[PDB]
Structure formats: structure tokens, C-alpha cells
From a paper:
Inosine-5′-monophosphate dehydrogenase ([name]; EC 1.1.1.205) catalyzes the oxidative reaction of [name] to xanthosine 5′-monophosphate (XMP), the rate-limiting step in the de novo synthesis of guanine nucleotides. Most IMPDHs are homotetramers in solution with each monomer composed of a catalytic and a regulatory domain. Adenine and guanine nucleotides compete for the canonical binding sites of the Bateman domain, inducing different [name] conformations with significantly different catalytic activity. These nucleotides control a conformational switch that allosterically regulates the catalytic activity of [name].
We further investigated these findings by solving the structure of AgIMPDH co-crystallized with ATP and GDP at 2.5 Å resolution. The overall structure of AgIMPDH-ATP/GDP was essentially identical to that of GDP octamers with only small variations, which were most probably due to differences in the crystal packing. Interestingly, the structure showed ATP bound to the first canonical site and GDP bound to the second and third nucleotide binding sites. The binding modes of ATP1 and GDP2/GDP3 in this structure were essentially identical to the binding modes observed for these nucleotides in their respective ATP and GDP complex structures. Also, as expected, the AgIMPDH monomers bound to ATP1 and GDP2/GDP3 behaved essentially identical than the AgIMPDH-GDP1/GDP2/GDP3 complex in MD and SMD computational simulations. Therefore, the occupancy of the second canonical and the third non-canonical nucleotide binding sites of the Bateman domain determined the conformation of AgIMPDH octamers and, therefore, its catalytic activity. Therefore, we decided to study the catalytic activity of AgIMPDH in vitro when both nucleotides are present in the solution. The upper panel of Fig. 5A clearly shows that GDP was able to inhibit the active octamers induced by ATP. In contrast, ATP could not activate the inhibited octamers induced by GDP. The fact that the non-canonical nucleotide binding site of eukaryotic IMPDHs is exclusive of GTP/GDP, implies that ATP cannot compete guanine nucleotides out of this site and allows GTP/GDP-induced allosteric inhibition to proceed independently on the adenine nucleotide concentrations. It also implies that the conformational switch is unidirectional, i.e. guanine nucleotides can inhibit ATP-induced octamers, but ATP cannot reverse GDP inhibition.
Residue numbers in the entry:
A (entry chain A): 2 to 32, 34 to 404, 406, 410 to 415, 418 to 422, 447 to 517, 520 to 522
B (entry chain B): 349 to 404, 406 to 407, 410 to 415, 418 to 423, 447 to 464
C (entry chain A): 291 to 348
D (entry chain A): 2 to 32, 34 to 58
E (entry chain A): 465 to 517, 520 to 522
F (entry chain B): 117 to 174
The structure:
């Protein structure tokens, strides 16, 4: 005779513990030293759609993203173009510092200025300038909407405005701006708040809305397209006060990078990552203390670390976030060259088990190549994941294509790394939404409605895991096939 | 084929398309040198962004009298090439 | 539940499941059979894409 | 609520042993038979330059 | 000189000022280790790349 | 590309914003002269374009 189906759930009680392993049982080191491909997360119960899953993630103590995606600070992945779009799509980009300090601050500057509420110090022009001059400025700045001030300074008296349609089909490039510019400009009086100035802008159906004071002097400007950028990207990572996209940047820990940071700070930097292969050093600790009291509004991510003791040191220094990973990265050899590193899964768990107790979010950096690694990285305690090789080869990553491949590189060229090449991947305007949607479905399969709920259900032993034998990793992927040809 | 058709066709002012076998600039020059007035490009332009279809082994696009289209042809795959706004 | 009372003579195989808790749920619903497997299949990537699955033997 | 960062180092005490394995725990044969590629050395604290390292 | 310099940097990453200090810190349990799963050995090196081209 | 757009896509005054947004997706452009009968050769009553419906919430 069999058991009654009515008792199926009642019978689950008779078993000691839940099917599978808790995270503790999965990560004890004595029974050890495992990575993302060595385990799976077991599925739970689905009682909600995948569109309902929230992927809000803490990047630092104070900064939260709508998606746990962070582009890595490497000169083949993250410059201005990458940082802008990672931010628009719910994440953030960390601009690389393999360039002079002026060049890096300019990149930060272009990210902070891509989208504005109130454009502070808008690019203006004097009445003496010509059409030939206004065309040159369009090629330099990317926009052609220039308020015309009497002295050519951002704070001069407003005389008119000139835009794309005022110079589009002008045959004489020697004309003065004063002759073709629109002189009766609709403006808003200074002191008007954003919601009020947005309404004036909408009602005119005009491109710009210069803001003037009582003297008639320019102070700021609004753009109709910033209202469009907001509507097109409702998850963009941007400051609530200024409406500008969040931007990050990496620096070293030597003396020269103290002045470097200041110039980045000046350019609007929201978060700095201390770029080091082994972060638990006196040089980096001093840097963290120095940044907290010199630029207190700047959020500091220290790293890289892979041990609990390292994390304690850099948290005690005042870190607002931790970057986890040493050698687990694509094209990284520190483990072969220095004999020093750690399997990434084990590093994430043991750092985050300690760091999370202090509310210090952690970036899982290195070894991430697909959605499953992201899920596992977060399952083990990470708050965000950093991506390098995944995003190299996309259109937004900096470089030129060429055995479509892009060269990928901390090697002698930039030895603890190598130079390589990755394949073309298209634009992240499609690729990031794909990872985002993919993480939603995986959270559904597991039975969690949010990453915050994901973290709680793991620590409580609700979510379960299974060790991965080398043979089961072959099952989890493609196997026993002659050939096989994700998205698009 | 191009030479002997165009040597006769051009006498009647009938332009000729050199069709097939073109994969690079050198073939275009030679096609014209032999009498062709224009050159037709198939595989060269497949795999560009303007070409129809979707991308997907080992960035490729399926290509092609083939049994699938309908055997005097085959089905294959060509590499991604970007937009013809730069390539042409 | 809807198939057991609407077409009672029809046998229902639910799935896929890979855990004891999943099986208990779908049996309690009235399943007449269970389909076991998540990602272990030839040409299947749910484990790489969803990080979710289980070795088939286990 | 979270823990104070001031207590980060004080809190390291509450853990039984240091993160990772000692060499003894790494080399017991019954738990075995490993080579160079089967283990890594975990990093510590840097408070000196690399030129200062003596390899006598 | 490359291997020499390389060993210096690795001793720095570990936190030891000399090989003699290296030996003492291991035997005392200060230096820590981690077992290597066949999957982590792939992470420690190059992986997920079309091609890759140390010194000079 | 045109010089003189022969028989331009028009809209009647009864159409709504929801209708003009559907047409932009179908035809790819939003510049619609408004004719009294909705036919291309009707009497011109006005014109509606992208900026006339961009931020309309109703
Ligand atoms: N705030 C304004 N007040 C008055 N006239 C304006 C204002 N903004 C633009 N104009 C005038 O209207 C025309 C441009 O409007 P807008 O600047 O809105 O078009 P654009 O900037 O040309 O963008 P598009 O490329 O879609 O035309 C120009 O003739 C310019 O002088
Ligand atoms: N001028 C301007 N206004 C913005 C921008 N972003 C948001 N707003 C305004 O802020 C208000 C709320 O925007 P909302 O989409 O709800 O949230 P947000 O995108 O995080 O600011 C709206 O009235 C917007 O018009 C921007 O980039 N530029
Ligand atoms: N016109 C102008 N735009 C700026 C400036 N700084 C940043 N921007 C941004 O660059 C974008 C310009 O878009 P758009 O107005 O359509 O370009 P334009 O029509 O040529 O002015 C907007 O999102 C602005 O917020 C500036 O100084 N002048
Ligand atoms: N409305 C409109 N006018 C055009 C177009 N193409 C050319 N024209 C006009 O025809 C005239 C000659 O243009 P041209 O520079 O010689 O180039 P072409 O007409 O295309 O051979 C100009 O006045 C153009 O403005 C078009 O596509 N639309
Ligand atoms: N507006 C409109 N454009 C057409 C039509 N048929 C062809 N077109 C072409 O589509 C393009 C539309 O231009 P666009 O600047 O996109 O206008 P808008 O988007 O409607 O503001 C032009 O080259 C037109 O000549 C039509 O029926 N209506
Ligand atoms: N050991 C080492 N790690 C690097 C180097 N360059 C970058 N990395 C790490 O590798 C990460 C990217 O690895 P990926 O995501 O491609 O697997 C970076 O975010 C950074 O943490 C290097 O030269 N040596
Ligand atoms: N994760 C996943 N499993 C699939 C998919 N399609 C089929 N399967 C599973 O794979 C089984 C066949 O695998 P095979 O017997 O070829 O190894 C099917 O019976 C089904 O359970 C899919 O698209 N994704």
C-alpha cells in the first residue's frame, strides 16, 4: 500500500533537513575551495511572474542601482560611452585610469553632462561668432543649441538662441550669429524649480528653456531631450537632486592619484574604486582615511580583497564598498605568477558573510561570463557583479574592431595579466536588458521576489544548493551533439 | 563569360551586370576591366546590418536555387560585417 | 487540480521537478506522475542561464 | 541595523580560526595527494615595498 | 632577474619580508591556503578568450 | 525619400492620441496632416507631429 497524497506536505516534516544544502554546508573549507561552476541553486516555488522581480542592488552604503551590473575599469571596456549607457540601463560604469588625469576627468565630465535637469554653465556663444564657428562647436560638443550672450560667457546677458534648424541650410558660413539667431527667446525666471520649469518647456514645444535672473543674465538651461532620455530610460542610475547619470572611476593608491581624484571629484564623480590587485595595504588604507575626511560626500570602494581579514582591515579604514576577486578574471594570471589568489565563489561567500554584517556592499569581480554566474555571485553574498570580458566587444566599449574581434587586456602592454581578444557582441542597449530579464527569471525559478529577499532566504537556509561534480557540469550545458548554434 | 558577353553586348549599348564570384575590391575592378558596367554582390553584403534576418556558431547569418529557398544551391552562413553606410 | 475534476479519467504527469519539496507540492495537487530533470538534457542550458538545476542522478 | 565599522577588527575575534587553511589542514593525507596547482596561498597585509623583500 | 623580482612581489602579496620570515609565518599558521578545485585552476589562468599573446 | 509626398498619410479629427501613437509605430513617422474626412484629399484642418503627442499623458 502507498501513502495518501493528502499527507504529501505533512510527510515533508518527517525529514531531518530540507532537500539539498544550506549555503553554510556548501562553503565549509575543510570538507573545499570551489567556484561558480561547482554548484547550482535548487529551485523553489513560483507564485509570481518574472516581471515582478526587483533587482535593486546596493553599490555602496549610500548608492543603490536598479540593476546589479557594473562595467569593469579597463581601457578595453569602460570609457565615457560605456559608462553613460550602463547608467541609463540601471547600472554604473567605472572609468579606467590607463590615461592621464585630465583625460580621465574629461571622460567623467562627459558622463555627468550626458543628461541634465538644469544644465549648469551651458555652452554659450557671442554675437560675433559665425555660422562656421557654430558648426565647429557642434562637431566638438555633439549639440548645437547655444544661447547667445553679450560677452560670450555663460553668465552674460541673454540676447538670443541658435540651434540646429537655424544653421541647417544656411549657405553663407560667414554670417554672424546675430543675424540668424532667434532673439525673442522663451525663458524661465531663476528660482523656478524643476517640475515648474519642465512644464514651461513642455508647453512651448521648443527645444530649450534658458533660465535667466532679474538682470537678464543666463544661469542655466533646460533641454527637451533630457525629458526624452528620462522617458526612454526609467531605470537610469542618476542623482535625485541633479538628474545626472551616476559615474564611477578607478584610481591607484600612490601620491599622484590624490591630485587625480580631486580632478575627478571636480568633474562630478559619485564613486571611486581603488584599483589594486591586493588592496589590504598601508598605502590603500591611508588613501581611504584621506578620502573620507577630504571628500566626505564621495563613496569609496576598496579592493580587491579575497579574505575576511582583508575585508575587516579596509572596512575599519572606512570603506563604503568592497571589490572581491584576485586572479579569477578572464585573461588574469596573478595566481600563476604570484601563487596568490582564491577561488571566486569561496572569496565572495567569506568576504560578504563578514562585510554584509557591517552593511558594506560587495562587488563580485572576475570570472563572470553569463547570467548563471551573476545569480550565483549574488546567492553567495555579493551585492553587485563586475563585468569585463562580457562587455568587451560590445559597441559601447572603447576600441576598433578587427582573425569580429576587439583586443582585450594589467599586462606589460597596459606581468600579472595577458593581452587577448574577444568577439563582437552588439550594443548593450540590448545586452543589458537581456541579463536583467535573465536574472528576473532565475529569481523566479528560485522563488524570490527580489535580490534583497534573495539574500535573506539564503542566510536563513531557505534557498538550497548542490555540489557540482565535473560530470554534472557537462549535463548542465550542451552535450552529446554534433554542433550547436541565447539572444537575437 | 563577362568578357565575351560584354564584348558583344557593349556594341549594342546594353550594360551588363557582372554577377557572382565577387568578394573584394579587386574582383570589382577586374569585372569592369573585362567589360562589365556594374557588379552584383551577394555574399559580400550578407551579414551586414542592413541585410535581412537575425544573427546567431563556433557572429554569423544563414545565407541562401537552394532546397530551402525552393537543388542547384546550398545553405550556409556568413560573418557579421557592420553597416554598409561604412562598407559601400 | 482543474484536470482531476474536469477530466477525471485523464492521467496527469507534472514536472519538471528536481527536489523533494517540489515533488510533495505537485503530488499534493493530485499528480499521477512526475517528470524529473532540470538542465541535464542534451542541448539544455537552464543551468548556465538560470544558475538553477540539479545533477540528474541526485 | 548594521555593525559599526570601528568594531570590524574587534569582530574578527569572534571567529574560531583565521580565514582559510593552515598548512597542516591543507596537507593531511587521509582527507590528499596534492601538487602545486591544487592550492593557492591567500594574501595577507602589505606594509613594505617589493624591493625590500630578501630572498636569501 | 624576472623570477627574482616576481618572487619578491608574491612575498609582498602574502605579507612576508623574507623567505626566512615566509617559513616562520607558515609553520605558525599565520599564512593561509585554499584547496584548488579543477574549476578554480581555470579561473586562476586565462579563460573565456579567443586568443592571448609575461616578460619582454 | 520624397520631394512631393504623393497621398501623404493623414488622420481625421476623431482619431485619438492612442491612434496617432499606433500609426507612428506602423508607418515609422508621426507628421500627420489632419483632414476633415480622414482621406488624403480632404479639407485641411491642421497638423499633428511628434512634439504634439510626445508628453501627453491622456
Ligand atoms: N526656448 C526657445 N525660445 C524661442 N525660440 C526657440 C527656443 N528654442 C529654440 N527656438 C527656435 O526654434 C527653432 C529650434 O527649435 P529646437 O531648438 O526646439 O529645434 P532643434 O533644436 O533644431 O532640434 P531638431 O533637430 O529636432 O530641430 C530655432 O529656430 C530656434 O531659434
Ligand atoms: N529637465 C529634466 N527633468 C527630469 C529629468 N529626469 C526626471 N525629470 C523630472 O523629474 C520628475 C520625476 O521623474 P521620474 O521619472 O518620476 O523619476 P526620475 O527619473 O528618477 O527623476 C519628472 O517631472 C521629470 O520631468 C531630466 O533628466 N531632465
Ligand atoms: N545644448 C546643450 N546641451 C547640453 C549641454 N550640456 C549637456 N547637454 C546635454 O546634451 C544633450 C543635447 O541634446 P539636444 O538638445 O537634442 O541637442 P541640440 O538640439 O543640438 O541642443 C542634452 O541632453 C543636454 O542635457 C550644453 O551645454 N548645451
Ligand atoms: N523636398 C526635396 N527636395 C529635394 C530632394 N532632393 C533634391 N531636392 C532639391 O532639388 C534641388 C537639387 O538638388 P541637388 O543638390 O542637385 O541633388 P539632386 O536633386 O538629388 O540631384 C535642390 O533644390 C534640392 O533641395 C528631396 O529629396 N526632397
Ligand atoms: N510624415 C510623412 N512622411 C513620409 C510619408 N511618406 C513618406 N514619408 C517620408 O518619411 C520621412 C519622414 O520624415 P520625418 O522627419 O521622420 O518626419 P516625422 O517623423 O514624421 O517628423 C520623410 O523623408 C518623408 O518624405 C508620409 O506619408 N508622411
Ligand atoms: N590578477 C589580475 N586581475 C585583473 C587584471 N586586470 C583586470 N583584472 C580583474 O579582472 C576583472 C575582469 O575579469 P573578467 O570579468 O573578464 O573575468 C577586473 O574587473 C579586475 O578585477 C590583471 O592584470 N591581473
Ligand atoms: N532546461 C531546458 N530543458 C529542455 C529544453 N528542451 C527540452 N528539455 C528537456 O530535455 C529533455 C531531453 O534531453 P535529452 O534526453 O536530449 O538529454 C526533454 O525531455 C526535456 O525535459 C529547454 O529548452 N531547456
Amino acid at each position: 500500500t502507498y501513502r495518501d497524497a493528502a499527507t504529501a506536505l505533512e510527510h515533508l516534516a518527517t525529514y531531518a533537513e530540507k532537500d539539498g544544502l544550506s549555503v553554510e554546508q556548501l562553503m565549509d573549507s575543510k570538507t573545499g575551495g570551489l567556484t561558480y561552476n561547482d554548484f547550482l541553486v535548487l529551485p523553489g516555488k513560483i507564485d509570481f511572474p518574472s516581471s515582478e522581480v526587483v533587482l535593486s542592488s546596493r553599490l555602496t552604503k549610500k548608492i543603490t542601482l536598479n540593476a546589479p551590473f557594473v562595467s569593469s575599469p579597463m581601457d578595453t571596456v569602460t570609457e565615457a560611452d560605456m559608462a553613460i549607457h550602463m547608467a541609463l540601463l540601471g547600472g554604473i560604469g567605472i572609468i579606467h585610469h590607463n590615461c592621464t588625469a585630465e583625460e580621465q576627468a574629461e571622460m567623467v565630465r562627459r558622463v555627468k553632462k550626458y543628461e541634465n535637469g538644469f544644465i549648469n554653465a551651458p555652452v554659450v556663444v557671442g554675437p560675433d561668432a559665425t555660422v562656421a564657428d557654430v558648426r565647429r562647436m557642434k562637431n566638438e560638443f555633439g549639440f548645437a543649441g547655444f544661447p547667445v550672450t553679450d560677452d560670450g560667457k555663460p553668465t552674460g546677458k541673454l540676447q538670443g538662441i541658435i540651434t540646429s534648424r537655424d544653421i541647417q541650410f544656411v549657405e553663407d558660413e560667414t554670417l554672424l550669429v546675430s543675424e540668424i539667431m532667434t532673439k525673442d527667446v522663451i525663458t524661465g525666471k531663476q528660482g523656478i524649480n524643476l517640475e515648474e520649469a519642465n512644464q514651461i518647456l513642455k508647453n512651448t514645444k521648443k527645444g530649450k528653456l534658458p533660465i535667466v535672473d532679474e538682470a537678464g543674465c543666463l544661469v542655466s538651461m533646460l533641454s527637451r531631450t533630457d525629458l526624452m532620455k528620462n522617458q526612454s530610460y526609467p531605470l537610469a542610475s542618476k542623482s535625485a537632486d541633479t538628474k545626472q547619470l551616476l559615474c564611477g572611476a578607478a584610481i591607484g593608491t600612490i601620491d599622484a592619484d590624490r591630485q587625480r581624484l580631486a580632478m575627478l571629484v571636480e568633474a562630478g564623480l559619485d564613486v571611486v574604486v581603488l584599483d589594486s590587485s591586493q588592496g589590504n595595504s598601508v598605502f590603500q588604507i591611508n588613501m581611504i582615511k584621506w578620502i573620507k575626511e577630504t571628500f566626505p560626500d564621495l563613496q569609496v570602494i576598496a579592493g580587491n580583497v579575497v579574505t575576511r581579514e582583508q575585508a575587516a582591515s579596509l572596512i575599519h579604514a572606512g570603506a563604503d564598498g568592497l571589490r572581491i576577486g584576485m586572479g579569477s578574471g578572464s585573461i588574469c594570471i596573478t595566481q600563476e605568477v604570484m601563487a596568490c589568489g582564491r577561488p571566486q565563489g569561496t572569496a565572495v561567500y567569506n568576504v560578504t558573510q563578514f562585510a554584509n554584517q557591517f552593511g558594506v556592499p560587495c562587488i563580485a569581480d572576475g570570472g563572470v561570463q553569463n547570467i548563471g554566474h551573476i545569480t550565483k555571485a549574488i546567492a553567495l553574498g555579493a551585492s553587485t557583479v563586475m563585468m569585463g570580458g562580457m562587455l568587451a566587444g560590445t559597441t559601447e566599449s572603447p576600441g576598433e574592431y578587427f582573425r569580429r574581434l576587439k583586443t582585450y587586456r594589467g599586462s606589460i602592454d597596459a606581468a600579472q595579466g595577458v593581452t587577448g581578444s574577444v568577439i563582437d557582441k552588439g550594443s548593450i542597449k540590448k545586452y543589458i536588458p537581456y541579463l536583467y530579464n535573465g536574472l528576473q527569471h532565475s529569481c523566479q525559478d528560485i522563488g524570490v521576489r527580489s535580490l534583497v529577499e534573495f539574500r535573506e532566504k539564503v542566510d536563513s537556509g531557505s534557498v538550497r544548493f548542490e555540489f557540482r561534480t565535473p560530470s554534472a557540469q557537462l549535463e548542465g550545458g550542451v552535450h552529446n551533439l554534433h554542433s550547436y548554434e541565447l539572444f537575437d | 563569360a563577362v568578357y565575351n558577353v560584354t564584348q558583344f553586348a557593349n556594341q549594342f549599348g546594353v550594360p551588363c551586370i557582372a554577377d557572382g564570384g565577387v568578394q573584394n575590391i579587386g574582383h570589382i575592378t577586374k569585372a569592369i576591366a573585362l567589360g562589365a558596367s556594374t557588379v552584383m554582390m551577394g555574399g559580400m553584403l550578407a551579414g551586414t546590418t542592413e541585410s535581412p534576418g537575425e544573427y546567431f556558431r563556433d557572429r554569423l547569418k544563414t545565407y541562401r536555387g537552394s532546397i530551402d529557398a525552393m537543388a542547384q544551391g546550398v545553405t550556409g552562413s556568413v560573418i557579421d560585417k557592420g553597416s554598409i553606410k561604412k562598407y559601400i
